[PDB]
Amino acid sequence: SPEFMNKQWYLLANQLILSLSKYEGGHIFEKLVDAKKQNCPDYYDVIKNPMSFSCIKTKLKKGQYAYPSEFVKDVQLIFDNCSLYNTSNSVVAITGKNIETYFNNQLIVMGYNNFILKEKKINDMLKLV
Numbered sequence: 001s002p003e004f005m006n007k008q009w010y011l012l013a014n015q016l017i018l019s020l021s022k023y024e025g026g027h028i029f030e031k032l033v034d035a036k037k038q039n040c041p042d043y044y045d046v047i048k049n050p051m052s053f054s055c056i057k058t059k060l061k062k063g064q065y066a067y068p069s070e071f072v073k074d075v076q077l078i079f080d081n082c083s084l085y086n087t088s089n090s091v092v093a094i095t096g097k098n099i100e101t102y103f104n105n106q107l108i109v110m111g112y113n114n115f116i117l118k119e120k121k122i123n124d125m126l127k128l129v
């Protein structure tokens, strides 16, 4: 059931974004960076597509993800901004790498990746039909 499936992976995404918020070090990605208060004034000169857990929660609450991959793309964007801005040996970069690993392993345990595969196959059915 295509609508039933949409409900399923929305529930998985909500559970996963919550697990990230509570994983060790998750708080530094919960909200968009306040550049002046965190002593990083150049942050938005470098990061032109900012993203945080709270942004993703808002898009989930508003039904703004159409496909399972779009949620993963937004979470991955957090980790890419983290590794771009912070040097590889910094606490923040290490923390971001650790949470990234967790997220990708949750995609496996929760079976979220199966929904991304079904999303691609449906897109191929439609392209034939």
Ligand SMILES: Cc1[nH]c(-c2cccc(N)c2)c2c1C(=O)CCCC2
Pocket: 027, 028, 029, 033, 038, 040, 043, 081, 082, 085, 086, 092
């Ligand atoms: C995504 C990110 N979060 C936080 C942060 C936020 C709240 C408290 C603390 N302690 C750190 C940072 C960050 C960066 O990569 C840019 C450098 C600033 C640090």
